[PDB]
C-alpha cells in the first residue's frame, strides 16, 4: 500500500526534506539509498514510503515541487539530497511572490501538468496506492496556491484515494509578509473540500515551544522544522511499522473524521525537554502521557480546554509497559471525561511501537480532532477581515485576474467552518 509524498514551495520542501531525513534514519536507509539497519521491522513496511531500485536501493516516493529553484537546490545539496529521484524535482523559475493567485491561477497553472506527470508515473508503479501526503505552508504562494491547485487536480484524477496534508498555518508572530491571512483563507477552503485529513501546524506554537519550553532564545525556521519533522515521524509511525490501529490512511480517516469537513487535527509531541543535563532524565509512562495531553506540547496554538475532543489517536514509541500505557491512557479519559464528547464512545485510540525515534528512549505523539481548532480559523478570519474591509493589498491578486467576490466567498466559507465546529462544541448526548 504505497503512499505518494508531495512537497511544495519553500516551507513544504524544507520540512519535507527534514521528514525524509528523519524517517530514512528510522528505517536504516543512508543518504545513498542503501539499507544498513539491524532490525527487520525497519523493512517490513518500507515500501509504504520507498521504492526499491536495482541493487536493492530504496528511493523515496517523493515529488519536490517549487516555482523557483532556490530551496530545491538546497535540498539537492542537503544531507539526504542525493536520495531523491532526480526526475522528481519539478520546478519553475518565476517564483510565486507569496501570492496565492500566482500559485493557483497563473504561475502555478503553467507548471502543474508537469507535476501531475510525475505523480502519474509514481502512482502507476503502485500495486495498491493508498493516497497522497502533501507538505506545504498556507501563508505563501507556491505551497498554498499551487499546493491546493495540485490537490484539486489529483482528486480529479484519483477521486477514490485518500488526500492527507501537513499544513503550516501562518501567524503574525512568525511572519514573512502581511498577505499571509489572504493566502491562508483562500487555501483553507480548498482543504475543507479536497483533503481527508489535515494536520494543522501553527508557526506560533512552534516558536513558543522553542522559546518557552526548549529555552532557545532565538528560534530559527530550522528549529521550528525539527519539531515538525519529529511530529510527522510520530503521526506516520502507524503507517510505517507493523500495527493494528490506523495502519493505513483510510482506516485512520474512518477513526478520526466523524463529519467530512471537520478533518483538521492538532498534533502534539512529548517529551519536549530543554537541552542540558535534564535531557538525559528518564521519562515514566505517566509523565509521558501527561505531557502528550498538555496544551504546551500541542502545535496548533489552540487550547484544547476551550473545546472538546471528537476523536484522539495516541502513538507511544519505545520500550515501555504496554499495560501501564493502557492504564495511563484510561486515567486521562476517566479523569477529564468532560473534554471528550460523550456521543462518540471510546473515541481515543492508542497505538504502541517498539522502535523509538532518534534521540529518545521513549516518545508519544498526539493527534486530536478537537473543536478548539476553531480558534485557529477565527484568528485567520479576524486578520483577513482587518485588511479586506479596506481592500488592503488586494491589487497583488486582482493583477493576476482574481475578483473581490472570490475573497468574499473564501471569508464566508471560513466563517461557516468556524460555526460548524461551534455546533459540536455544545452538542450533548
Amino acid at each position: 500500500r504505497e503512499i505518494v509524498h508531495i512537497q511544495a514551495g519553500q516551507c513544504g520542501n524544507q520540512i519535507g526534506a527534514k521528514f525524509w531525513e528523519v524517517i530514512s534514519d528510522e528505517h536504516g536507509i543512508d543518504p545513498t539509498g542503501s539499507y544498513h539497519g539491524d532490525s527487520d521491522l525497519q523493512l517490513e513496511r518500507i515500501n509504504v514510503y520507498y521504492n526499491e531500485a536495482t541493487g536493492n536501493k530504496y528511493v523515496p516516493r517523493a515529488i519536490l515541487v517549487d516555482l523557483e529553484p532556490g530551496t530545491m537546490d538546497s535540498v539537492r545539496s542537503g544531507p539526504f539530497g542525493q536520495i531523491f529521484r532526480p526526475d522528481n524535482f519539478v520546478f519553475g523559475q518565476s517564483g510565486a511572490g507569496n501570492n496565492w493567485a500566482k500559485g493557483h491561477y497563473t504561475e502555478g497553472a503553467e507548471l502543474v501538468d508537469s507535476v501531475l506527470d510525475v505523480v502519474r508515473k509514481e502512482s502507476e508503479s503502485c500495486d495498491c496506492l493508498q493516497g497522497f501526503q502533501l507538505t506545504h505552508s498556507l501563508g505563501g504562494g507556491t505551497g498554498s496556491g499551487m499546493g491546493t491547485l495540485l490537490i484539486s487536480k489529483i482528486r480529479e484524477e484519483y477521486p477514490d484515494r485518500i488526500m492527507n496534508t501537513f499544513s503550516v498555518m501562518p501567524s503574525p508572530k512568525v511572519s514573512d509578509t502581511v498577505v499571509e491571512p489572504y493566502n491562508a483563507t483562500l487555501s483553507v477552503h480548498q482543504l475543507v473540500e479536497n483533503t481527508d485529513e489535515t494536520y494543522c501546524i501553527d508557526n506560533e506554537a512552534l516558536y513558543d515551544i522553542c522559546f518557552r519550553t526548549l529555552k532557545l532564545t532565538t528560534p530559527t525556521y530550522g528549529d521550528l522544522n525539527h519539531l515538525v519533522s519529529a511530529t510527522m515521524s510520530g503521526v506516520t509511525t502507524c503507517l510505517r511499522f507493523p500495527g493494528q490501529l490506523n495502519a493505513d490512511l483510510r482506516k485512520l480517516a474512518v477513526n478520526m473524521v466523524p463529519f467530512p469537513r471537520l478533518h483538521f487535527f492538532m498534533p502534539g509531541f512529548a517529551p519536549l525537554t530543554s537541552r542540558g543535563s535534564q535531557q538525559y532524565r528518564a521519562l515514566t509512562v505517566p509523565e509521558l502521557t501527561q505531557q502528550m495531553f498538555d496544551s504546551k506540547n500541542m502545535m496548533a496554538a489552540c487550547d484544547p480546554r476551550h473545546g472538546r475532543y471528537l476523536t484522539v489517536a495516541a502513538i507511544f514509541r519505545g520500550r515501555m509497559s504496554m499495560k501501564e500505557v493502557d492504564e495511563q491512557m484510561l486515567n486521562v479519559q476517566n479523569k477529564n471525561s468532560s473534554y471528550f464528547v460523550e456521543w462518540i464512545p471510546n473515541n481515543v485510540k492508542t497505538a504502541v511501537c517498539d522502535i523509538p525515534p532518534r534521540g529518545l528512549k521513549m516518545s508519544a505523539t498526539f493527534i486530536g480532532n478537537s473543536t478548539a481548532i476553531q480558534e485557529l480559523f477565527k484568528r485567520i478570519s479576524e486578520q483577513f477581515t482587518a485588511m479586506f474591509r479596506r481592500k488592503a493589498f488586494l491589487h497583488w491578486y486582482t493583477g493576476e485576474g482574481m475578483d473581490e467576490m472570490e475573497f468574499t466567498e473564501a471569508e464566508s466559507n471560513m466563517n461557516d467552518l468556524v460555526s460548524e465546529y461551534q455546533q459540536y462544541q455544545d452538542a450533548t448526548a
Binding site: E327, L330, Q333, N334, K335, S337, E342, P345
Partner: protein
C-alpha cells in the same frame, strides 16, 4: 479522583449522599449520561444494570441490587415468602397473605376465610386502601394486582393515647453482602386513639392530612428508639432490645439471606449496595410482624445526616477509599 453520576433527582437520601461526596473534595459529579463513572446513584425504574461493569479501568458501583424488587413489591414478597423453603408457608413472623388479581389464589383465601369466621376467631383483613370484615367488600374494591392479608387486630398500643404505630428500620447491604442495621429506628405513630369498631393507618402523610392530634405526643408522630425503650421499661418492664429488636434482626437476616444467591454481586463485573426500609408491627404480646420492605426509603429528618454519612463510610468509601452507627447482622 472518583467520579459518580446522579440519576434519581427525587431521592432525598442520595441527594444528601452526593452533597457529602462532593464535600469530600475527592469526588466529582459527571453528567448523568457520562459512562465513565465509578459510582452510579441510579434511577428507581429500569436502571440499566446491563451496561454496568463494561468500562475498562473503572471499578463501578451502583446503589441498587438488581433483583431486590422481589422483596420490595407487595405481591412479590408474598410469593417469595410462601415459595422459598428458607421462609416457608409456616413462617411465624409474616401475617397470612394472598395474592389476588382483578378483572392468583383468590380461591385459597376464601377457604381460610370460611374457617376463620365460622369459628368466630376474628376475621379482619386489609387490602388507596381499605380494611373490611366481609370478603365481599374486599374482592369488590380490587376489581376497580393486590394482596389481602390478616389485619393484626390486637396491636400494641402506646399510652397515654391508646395509639397504634409501626416501626421503620433502615438496613444497608454493602457489596460484600454485609447486612448493617442502622442503630436508629423510628416509630410512625397514630395520634388518634385506636378505635376497634384513619386511626388504623400510621402513614406519616395520612396522619398529617387526616389526623386531628398530629404532633401532640411527639414531634411529627415520630417516636425514636430512646423514648420507646424508656416506655417499654416503664410500662411493660422490658427493653426494646429484648422484646422487639431480636425479632427485627432475625426477620431482616432471614429475608436478605433468602435472596442473596439471586442478587449477590460477589463475582459480578459490577458491584451493588442498597438501602432498605423494613416496616414492622408489634402486637400486644410483643410479637413482631413484618409488614413490607421498601427499596427506595426516605429517612427521618433528624437522622438524615447520620445515616447518609454512614452510607458513605460503609457502602461507598469501602470500595473507593479516601486519602459505628450500624449493627452488623452476622451469617
Amino acid at each position: 479522583m472518583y467520579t459518580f453520576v446522579v440519576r434519581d433527582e427525587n431521592s432525598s437520601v442520595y441527594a444528601e449522599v452526593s452533597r457529602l461526596l462532593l464535600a469530600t473534595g475527592q469526588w466529582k459529579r459527571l453528567r448523568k449520561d457520562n459512562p465513565r463513572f465509578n459510582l452510579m446513584l441510579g434511577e428507581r425504574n429500569r436502571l440499566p444494570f446491563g451496561r454496568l461493569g463494561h468500562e475498562p479501568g473503572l471499578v463501578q458501583l451502583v446503589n441498587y441490587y438488581r433483583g431486590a424488587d422481589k422483596l420490595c413489591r407487595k405481591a412479590s414478597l408474598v410469593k417469595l415468602i410462601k415459595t422459598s423453603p428458607e421462609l416457608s408457608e409456616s413462617c411465624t413472623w409474616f401475617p397470612e397473605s394472598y395474592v389476588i388479581y382483578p378483572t392468583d389464589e383468590r380461591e385459597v383465601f376464601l377457604a381460610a376465610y370460611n374457617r376463620r369466621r365460622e369459628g368466630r376467631e376474628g376475621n379482619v383483613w386489609i387490602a388507596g386502601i381499605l380494611i373490611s370484615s366481609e370478603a365481599s367488600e374486599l374482592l369488590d374494591f380490587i376489581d376497580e394486582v393486590h394482596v389481602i392479608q390478616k389485619y393484626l387486630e390486637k396491636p400494641l398500643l402506646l399510652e397515654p393515647g391508646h395509639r397504634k404505630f409501626d416501626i421503620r428500620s433502615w438496613v444497608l447491604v454493602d457489596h460484600l453482602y454485609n447486612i448493617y442495621l442502622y442503630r436508629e429506628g423510628v416509630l410512625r405513630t397514630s395520634s388518634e386513639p385506636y378505635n376497634s369498631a384513619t386511626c388504623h393507618l400510621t402513614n406519616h402523610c395520612i396522619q398529617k392530612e387526616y389526623s386531628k392530634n398530629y404532633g401532640r405526643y411527639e414531634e411529627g408522630n415520630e417516636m425514636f428508639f430512646e423514648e420507646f425503650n424508656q416506655y417499654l421499661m416503664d410500662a411493660l418492664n422490658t427493653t426494646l432490645e429484648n422484646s422487639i429488636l431480636l425479632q427485627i434482626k432475625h426477620i431482616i437476616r432471614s429475608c436478605l439471606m433468602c435472596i442473596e444467591p439471586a442478587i449477590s454481586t460477589k463475582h459480578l463485573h459490577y458491584q451493588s449496595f442498597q438501602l432498605f426500609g423494613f416496616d414492622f408491627m408489634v402486637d400486644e404480646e410483643l410479637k413482631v410482624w413484618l409488614i413490607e420492605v421498601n427499596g427506595a426509603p426516605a429517612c427521618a429528618q433528624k437522622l438524615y445526616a447520620e445515616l447518609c454519612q454512614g452510607i458513605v463510610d460503609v457502602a461507598i468509601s469501602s470500595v473507593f477509599p479516601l486519602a459505628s452507627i450500624f449493627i452488623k447482622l452476622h451469617h
